[PDB]
Amino acid sequence: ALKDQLIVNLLKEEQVPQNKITVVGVGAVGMACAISILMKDLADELALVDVIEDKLKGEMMDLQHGSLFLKTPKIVSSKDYSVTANSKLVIITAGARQQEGESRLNLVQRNVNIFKFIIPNVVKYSPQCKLLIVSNPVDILTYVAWKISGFPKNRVIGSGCNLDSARFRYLMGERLGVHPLSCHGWVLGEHGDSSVPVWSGVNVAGVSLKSLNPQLGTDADKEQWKDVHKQVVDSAYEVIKLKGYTSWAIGLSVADLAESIMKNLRRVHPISTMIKGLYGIKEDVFLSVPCILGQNGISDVVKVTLTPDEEARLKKSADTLWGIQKELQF
Amino acid sequence: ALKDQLIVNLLKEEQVPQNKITVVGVGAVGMACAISILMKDLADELALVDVIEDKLKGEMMDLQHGSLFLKTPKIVSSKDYSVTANSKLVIITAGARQQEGESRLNLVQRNVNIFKFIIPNVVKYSPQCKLLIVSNPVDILTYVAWKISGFPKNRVIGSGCNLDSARFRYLMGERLGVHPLSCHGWVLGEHGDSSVPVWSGVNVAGVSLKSLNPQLGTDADKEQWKDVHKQVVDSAYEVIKLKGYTSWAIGLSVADLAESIMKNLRRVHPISTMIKGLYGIKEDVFLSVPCILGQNGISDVVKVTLTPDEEARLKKSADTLWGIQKELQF
Amino acid sequence: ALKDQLIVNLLKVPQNKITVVGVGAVGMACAISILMKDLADELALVDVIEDKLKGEMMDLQHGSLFLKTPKIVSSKDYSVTANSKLVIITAGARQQEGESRLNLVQRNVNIFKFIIPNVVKYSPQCKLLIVSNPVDILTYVAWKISGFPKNRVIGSGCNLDSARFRYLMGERLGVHPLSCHGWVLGEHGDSSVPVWSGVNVAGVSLKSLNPQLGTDADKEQWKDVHKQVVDSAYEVIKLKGYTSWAIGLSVADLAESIMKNLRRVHPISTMIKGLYGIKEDVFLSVPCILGQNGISDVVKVTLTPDEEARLKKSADTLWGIQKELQF
Amino acid sequence: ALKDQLIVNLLKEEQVPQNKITVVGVGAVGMACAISILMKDLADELALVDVIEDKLKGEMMDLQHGSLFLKTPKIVSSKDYSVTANSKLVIITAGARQQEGESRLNLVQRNVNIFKFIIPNVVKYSPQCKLLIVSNPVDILTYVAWKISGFPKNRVIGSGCNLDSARFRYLMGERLGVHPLSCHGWVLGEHGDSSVPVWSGVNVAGVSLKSLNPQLGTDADKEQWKDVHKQVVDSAYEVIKLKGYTSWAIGLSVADLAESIMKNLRRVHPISTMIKGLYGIKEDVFLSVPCILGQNGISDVVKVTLTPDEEARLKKSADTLWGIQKELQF
């Protein structure tokens, strides 16, 4: 055989990857996550899982064919979760997605059922992984993942408001004529309609925009900055109306969380976690606060000082979500 | 104004971009090209153009929402080609795409008709650009873009066999247990059914595989390496048969070429250029031969030493391409 | 020729060229970081000692397989620098153990008297990025000698200082410096001003959780962190004889914003006449928006009366030196 | 405390680094390896070791102050090898370096003594580490590291001729006006005066240059390509006499090797390994041949096809190296 004429083998390795990532779901969101993860050199193996055989294999092959341009030496796929074995990070994007007009809350039973199958299969093959939940409603499904996995809460993370805050800083950048890296602001709580823009923290170079304009984010705001937050909330509906779905921004957002997890950076991201203990929250509610994300998932939470009005929203969002998730059957 | 309280403007802005790239066509190929180029930090400005307004705007927005995770401070879109002004590189992906069972060669009339509209509009606003033709049949469409543009031939490049060769190298590495980066081999000629695998150049670490197994790639081969070329030829069709279209790998192939152009690398790539005066071809045929690629496009061509069979196969590719080029009007 | 039978040639200026003046330790650190962030299609190096220059060039060139900057050149002659987008000046006398950066001022004015016209001659449209010390005063000098508009004469300023401050903050809090925000402004030196009002994590003002933050009264002595920033160059010089890596990385970051027109904000040396009670041609670090045309805008940070005194002080000290200079 | 007010700790846990690298030696080579490794994002922890405490602490400090601009969250140092605990890769650059007119083979007795202390101490705390030897004479010292450590050969690698071939390819590129990446060719054997340029494998785009001119590399070469190899043999000495030492190129060479190991890429590199069994070599000689480098070090060796002259030169190199091995006093 040619190969053995060309190559003398020295040892038969256990081929166990050290930086394996799995993306479950090869719809648009999942493939966007896949490509962004590949072009950020985060993993040594990328596994794809979904339930339509032909599409799954088509996507696997299409990624495969770009390998010369990448630094991820093994890309694999299967309906069978054995393909996901030994992943450090499993990112779940499967499920029904919101159609035009449709609230993310309408996705909940469909996606809880899909997770009843998905989550046990992930755990069986990567008992030590971190879970990053992207499917919607992300806050409730992060909770569902947690319960079915049995994982300690540090290892079950939701993409949450990471994107909402990225979008926020982009709009702001565009208003100010400044790169969004240098524009800071946080959108926290539910990923969706009831999110809370924390106006008090919104700053460029440590200079608080609220201190310069005390009306910032109020109906009295000469410049209507509140519409920046409306734009954030409406963003995914707007994009779904225009192109049918969202992919690139969320892929990029998930990749950025993957980077923090895989490289143990300990950056701060506003992502979905279990916040019992805070802002008046007595139950097992997951929603977005600034979290320090690392190799062990969410290790620490930053306590943001909310105004009474700001804190009032949060407990609302909070109450809503508990009402829905309280009564789920799985 | 909250901006002026925050920011003292010190300089009047005549913003002209220095490294602007345009992608024409926002189908799955174009957006794969876009995302890949954004994640390789090649452009200070990215313009998108296509004819379905809503689709266009939603793609634009979706990418803009990822701006925080990117280094391309300006992303814009319009059906109007003035949005493409001052581009250093324009990448043309618009046009009809082959169905399952349909040759890329069957796309020629539809895509020539669209090229009569696209190329003059590109050239109008970006007199300095290189044109990177992706739309199919890419080799004939490179020729066509050249004829319409009035650009010199060095500035009109077809994506050509850059993908075919990545696939070949990928499949080769899989067989040998070597990264594609370290497996060498060239697929030349038409980007399509009549492509030519140059077995004589196929090597790992400078070791010719054909000299190891002389019947490499013939029907006599005990290991049927020709099936590797058959897989290269078929791959678009297999992927299309499975997922509907191809996107990620062609996108990576095009970002690779764009890297070489924008960063003046002078790397060698198998891409579409005029081969008149080689291999006994005296007509204006464009097909892939290995080309040195830089800031002024294709500046040099490597004359591959071809075995009589290989050269005959290359001439037959040229013959097939000329059979369709022969009859064109525009 | 072998070549002409291998290659048929069809066709006979760089577009993203950076020059680095000075191939001492900081200059070479600047060189390597720029080469690893793929910011340039040509890198040129200039200094006055010819073997040293040549050998740094060759050493970089030998790693070309691993880089994506296809042309690396060097020369004593400034014609090598032609068509630069950005010229980074690191040449001059360098800080010595237990000595202020202000002790280098006069000697470095004298070399810039030679360097700067030569840079301007071969790239009259470049951005100048000054790194040599004392950078604030030398950015002023570069600006007067060059005749460039002020947006194009940038001083590396307090970019490193704030990065140091952000590392140390991050060590204290157990958070990546990327998620620890805070600004050190004014003189790149002993009179720098930590702005405690802006120091935060996830938008949460550290000063609101401890109003005494950064003062004599702070139970947690956060003032020490700025003292550590002030003293770090002296420490590093004591231990290893100079500093190089951290400055290289600061300068690469600035170069990144410039070459890629990012319009990020940086605390870098710019002309401050007409802010903060300053009516002279002084340069010091304030948060500047940095892009392809250099410094286009400045953020007006809101300063507490000390912060402004302490800064108009820093401003004073420095115009105190730049006053009696002649050129 | 302000920390505790700002940040609720959710999780105690022992931080075990997953991708740690140590560099032994903080002279110019060691630090060049370090800055390159940090700038390619290969490690989640970097540890430095050397014998002079101030110098080591100052180098550590200076890197640390650039943390804002890096993605390697933990940088540490110590005279004490416990700081290197749980490394995946330990790079050894400590020892004497050659003077103008001095062979790297003159460094052997001094560097063997240093290695007697360093090696048991570096392998003590790192069960999973690979040893990448950089100090000279690298081939002999890779052998010595192998004998002292008791590691299996796949885990003990010499930087070898990775840089010689890089230099070869740069010079080649400058002759032909092609980027090094697309110029191919191997310098094998000793990293030093008895290296062997493999002209039979030297190619652009699969095109063998010897095929085009069989005088290539001989005294009858009208173009004197032998001089390119000569330039490779003398490079270090040339640079040593212009600037006092070499640093950047070797740093990049080693970071490239580190990349293949850390990212399990399985690329081929000419690096030091045991060649007992090949080219009629019957003893435990170490020298550079092309090896597949991955997460377990060298898993495979490519059997280069040598001409009788090439092979004689390799065997001659092997004799010289074996001859100094007979001098080794353990």
Ligand SMILES: O=C(O)C(Oc1ccc(Br)cc1)C(=O)O
């Ligand atoms: O764009 C956004 O805001 C998000 O997009 C997606 C989120 C999850 C999936 Br699965 C698909 C798209 C969102 O819907 O939260």
Ligand SMILES: O=C(O)C(Oc1ccc(Br)cc1)C(=O)O
């Ligand atoms: O995957 C491949 O081989 C190629 O992909 C595309 C090339 C151009 C466009 Br427009 C769309 C797809 C091909 O179909 O030639």
Ligand SMILES: O=C(O)C(Oc1ccc(Br)cc1)C(=O)O
């Ligand atoms: O480390 C720092 O803070 C600074 O570093 C340098 C700045 C310029 C040159 Br030239 C050399 C070192 C400083 O010493 O001011």
Ligand SMILES: O=C(O)C(Oc1ccc(Br)cc1)C(=O)O
């Ligand atoms: O430039 C080169 O070829 C090599 O550089 C170094 C190799 C190891 C150390 Br420790 C220091 C320099 C060489 O001298 O072998």
